[PDB]
Design a protein around this ligand. Sequence first.
Ligand SMILES: *[C@H]1O[C@H](CO)[C@@H](O[C@@H]2O[C@@H](C)[C@H](O)[C@@H](O)[C@H]2O)[C@H](O)[C@@H]1O[C@H]1O[C@H](C(=O)O)[C@@H](O[C@@H]2O[C@H](CO)[C@@H](O[C@H]3O[C@@H](C)[C@@H](O[C@@H]4O[C@H](CO)[C@H](O)[C@H](O[C@@H]5O[C@H](CO)[C@H](O)[C@H](O)[C@H]5NC(C)=O)[C@H]4NC(C)=O)[C@@H](O)[C@@H]3O)[C@H](O)[C@H]2O)[C@H](O)[C@H]1O
Ligand SMILES: *[C@H]1O[C@H](CO)[C@@H](O[C@@H]2O[C@@H](C)[C@H](O)[C@@H](O)[C@H]2O)[C@H](O)[C@@H]1O[C@H]1O[C@H](C(=O)O)[C@@H](O[C@@H]2O[C@H](CO)[C@@H](O[C@H]3O[C@@H](C)[C@@H](O[C@@H]4O[C@H](CO)[C@H](O)[C@H](O[C@@H]5O[C@H](CO)[C@H](O)[C@H](O)[C@H]5NC(C)=O)[C@H]4NC(C)=O)[C@@H](O)[C@@H]3O)[C@H](O)[C@H]2O)[C@H](O)[C@H]1O
Ligand SMILES: *[C@H]1O[C@H](CO)[C@@H](O[C@@H]2O[C@@H](C)[C@H](O)[C@@H](O)[C@H]2O)[C@H](O)[C@@H]1O[C@H]1O[C@H](C(=O)O)[C@@H](O[C@@H]2O[C@H](CO)[C@@H](O)[C@H](O)[C@H]2O)[C@H](O)[C@H]1O
Ligand code: BMA
Ligand code: BMA
Ligand code: CA
Lengths: 447, 254
Amino acid sequence: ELTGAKLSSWNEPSPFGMIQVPRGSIVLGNKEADSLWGIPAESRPISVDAFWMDRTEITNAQYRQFVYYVRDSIIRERLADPAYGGNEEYKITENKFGEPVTPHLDWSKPIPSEKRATEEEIAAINSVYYTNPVTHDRKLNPDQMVYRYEVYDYRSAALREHQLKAAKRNLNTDIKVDPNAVVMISKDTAFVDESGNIISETITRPLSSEYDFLNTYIVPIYPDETCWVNDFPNARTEIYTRMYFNHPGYDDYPVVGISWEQAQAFCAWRSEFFRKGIRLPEGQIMDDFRLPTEAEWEYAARMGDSNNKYPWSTEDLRTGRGCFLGNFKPGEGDYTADGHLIPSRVSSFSPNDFGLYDMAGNVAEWTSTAFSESGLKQMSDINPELEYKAALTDPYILKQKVVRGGSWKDVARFIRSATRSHEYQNVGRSYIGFRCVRTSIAFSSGK
Amino acid sequence: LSNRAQEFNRRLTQKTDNAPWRRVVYRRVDLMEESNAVLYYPPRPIGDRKNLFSTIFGLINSNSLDVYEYLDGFEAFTDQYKIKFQEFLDRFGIYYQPSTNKNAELFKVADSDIPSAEVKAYYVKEEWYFTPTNSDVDIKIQAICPIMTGQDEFGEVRNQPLFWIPYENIRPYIARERVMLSSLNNTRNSTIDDFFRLNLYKGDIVKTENLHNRALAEYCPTPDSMKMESKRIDKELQGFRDGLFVTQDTTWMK
Ligand SMILES: *[C@H]1O[C@H](CO)[C@@H](O[C@@H]2O[C@@H](C)[C@H](O)[C@@H](O)[C@H]2O)[C@H](O)[C@@H]1O[C@H]1O[C@H](C(=O)O)[C@@H](O[C@@H]2O[C@H](CO)[C@@H](O[C@H]3O[C@@H](C)[C@@H](O[C@@H]4O[C@H](CO)[C@H](O)[C@H](O[C@@H]5O[C@H](CO)[C@H](O)[C@H](O)[C@H]5NC(C)=O)[C@H]4NC(C)=O)[C@@H](O)[C@@H]3O)[C@H](O)[C@H]2O)[C@H](O)[C@H]1O
Ligand SMILES: *[C@H]1O[C@H](CO)[C@@H](O[C@@H]2O[C@@H](C)[C@H](O)[C@@H](O)[C@H]2O)[C@H](O)[C@@H]1O[C@H]1O[C@H](C(=O)O)[C@@H](O[C@@H]2O[C@H](CO)[C@@H](O[C@H]3O[C@@H](C)[C@@H](O[C@@H]4O[C@H](CO)[C@H](O)[C@H](O[C@@H]5O[C@H](CO)[C@H](O)[C@H](O)[C@H]5NC(C)=O)[C@H]4NC(C)=O)[C@@H](O)[C@@H]3O)[C@H](O)[C@H]2O)[C@H](O)[C@H]1O
Ligand SMILES: *[C@H]1O[C@H](CO)[C@@H](O[C@@H]2O[C@@H](C)[C@H](O)[C@@H](O)[C@H]2O)[C@H](O)[C@@H]1O[C@H]1O[C@H](C(=O)O)[C@@H](O[C@@H]2O[C@H](CO)[C@@H](O)[C@H](O)[C@H]2O)[C@H](O)[C@H]1O
Ligand SMILES: *[C@@H]1O[C@H](CO)[C@@H](O)[C@H](O)[C@@H]1O
Ligand SMILES: *[C@@H]1O[C@H](CO)[C@@H](O)[C@H](O)[C@@H]1O
Ligand SMILES: [Ca+2]
């Protein structure tokens, strides 16, 4: 009798600070085209499955939690390092029964305070900070705030042509697969040399084992606070470089200067940190916090309805009382006609019908989609995605990722939820943030 | 190209293998019309500024493009129909003088004599297909045929096609250089590959893969008749897509 072999029911830990956007369909792009802007009209209807999008942009405090975690563990490594310290109580290398185990950090053992720390401990602590020779500003060294994380390409491990068994690479019985045909694939690795220099590489080699879909990255994660200065020549933006990521008043403000690589590192750290804090029922396959796709971003921005040019119900950019609905550049040289010159505190304007805040304004938002002028037509309509893990030797033009949404300077057009904007994955601007997203574990009814 | 780029391009290939519906139609993109002049922008090569025909001519001059003869009636892309460059220059009347071959350029052709500004239209073979895996209609460019808008004195405009260019052969060399799509925004932000992939070209259907291998010209005496027939074919191609989906029907609210 075919009764069925079900599995033990799991649990859905609704992530903190996120809302649930329902699955739905939307017509990506603006149907009517402004001829004065030269662009034609490019629209394609899509459908996206339900996911968890963060309520607001990542604030300065939320990214400072990341940089503090990276700091703490690097400091713990230095304390365990025989060179700086050598305590060995911060690096659990053997289990309570005495057998060798994978070396991990002892997060229970507190980091000594600046006063109580001895010479070795104080040396380990200070070996990660930077003291400015002239101004005596003891700040975290930007090139030492590096995050080492690993990403397994589940997508690329599933392609038919990327099957480990050569016979399974072609289901056509008329096609005889050469026994020794080489399938060259690339994998992004990164290793700290003896000097201490981050060595990133893209290893191209024939498909041999599952160790070829594992991409290892060591990304410096400290925000580029000099974007405020570099992005605006001949301007008094020296103060936001020294204030934005450091001042306690600028904690709820969206983080700026975060590059695409740093955003991916932050989302991966968030994923593994969430996993560390939640017990998994046996067999639990939990998804990872990820940067939203272009299609998912546009869907959640326009509240699913294809009639919405903006993240608000009407087409006007201003309420009936005269209050703007976003943080952008309303007029010529008038960034602060909406009340805010630079980005504003998150959750300062009205949200969507979904509940998303600052969905078009404040800072533009990184997406996980590689940028292509024909990108909308080259990607499928089921959870659309144009993913391109660029190689270290690729042309710099191939490293563009879509930055969808408007910033505190985007004019009405660039704040429209259907206007594509891009920027290089390497650079981080003073008007670009991000918003980690994760796929919803949802089994709901229909409409 | 890096292996990552190669894998990306392999993913970005349209597979019209098991499509339940296909429709092969030929267009006559006139470059002397806006939205189709992107392929004519530089009538004559200007340093690093070249139109499609100039790029194609240079590519064939370097044995880097496999183009096939314009056979009236059909488009067989076989090694038999690979064109002979010297014959092409001679038969269409192009004055060339052979320079140092250096295995780079077969014949030295002066830019003044390259018929790059007379090719004022293109035959575009595009194959509308219904994707079997996600039920989506898409257009796949098969080949482009540069037609030289020549002048036959007694016979005035001759409009004789030159050759047929399989699109996958020309795609690598047109997916890199940037062009401006509009005359109002002169930003070189997209490529001609994007122009063809987004179907930004505007052309009148001059032939469909008919069962009698008949072209519109045969049963349409005057240009207006060809215009209305092309409109009819466009309306039926659009009606296919319209009839596929049923979310616009309101017969239920009755
Ligand atoms: C801080 O961060 C810096 C930036 O990244 C980094 O700096 C870098 O290195 C410096 C040297 C360099 O100077 C810098 O430039 C820079 O390159 C720092 O080094 C530091 O990061 C480093 O240390 C971290 C740390 O240890 O805190 C590392 O993060 C930890 O990694 C662990 C493994 O890599 C994670 O553990 C997971 O995987 C295993 C090991 C589990 O741990 C135990 O495993 C045992 C067996 O070995 C037990 O069996 C048990 O495993 C269970 O197994 C069942 C199935 O049987 C389940 O499937 C699970 O796997 C697990 N169950 C659970 C829930 O426990 C585990 N229990 C015990 C005995 O502890 C497991 O806990 C984890 O899944 C760990 O989570 C993570 O924090 C960081 O990788 C490293 O770079
Ligand atoms: C990015 O890539 C950088 C360069 O690779 C790397 O940097 C390097 O490490 C830094 C830490 C350091 O600064 C420098 O050393 C630097 O150069 C980065 O860490 C980063 O690496 C990431 O990607 C790497 C990559 O794939 O390129 C990963 O490397 C992989 O490591 C695996 C674990 O070590 C390797 O797996 C096994 O592979 C086989 C060949 C093993 O060789 C022996 O083979 C014999 C014949 O079979 C033995 O019988 C026995 O066979 C294996 O036995 C084990 C038992 O567990 C297996 O499970 C299988 O049974 C069997 N394997 C086969 C062939 O099926 C093996 N004997 C041994 C020694 O155990 C051996 O080499 C590995 O065990 C994998 O090959 C390798 O690519 C890296 O892990 C990742 O972080
Ligand atoms: C592109 O077309 C849009 C159409 O909306 C124009 O917007 C119009 O003009 C602006 C000032 C206002 O927002 C509205 O009045 C709006 O309706 C936009 O300015 C651009 O206009 C350019 O192209 C137009 C076009 O291609 O239709 C030209 O209009 C006509 O063009 C034909 C070309 O053959 C010409 O024969 C007509 O005389 C001309 O009116 C605009 O001239 C041109 O600026
Ligand atoms: C073009 O259109 C004319 C219109 O009268 C027809 O008569 C002709 O046969 C062709 O279809
Ligand atoms: C939908 O119902 C009928 C039948 O489709 C239409 O004619 C009417 O306009 C309504 O919108
Ligand atoms: Ca503003």
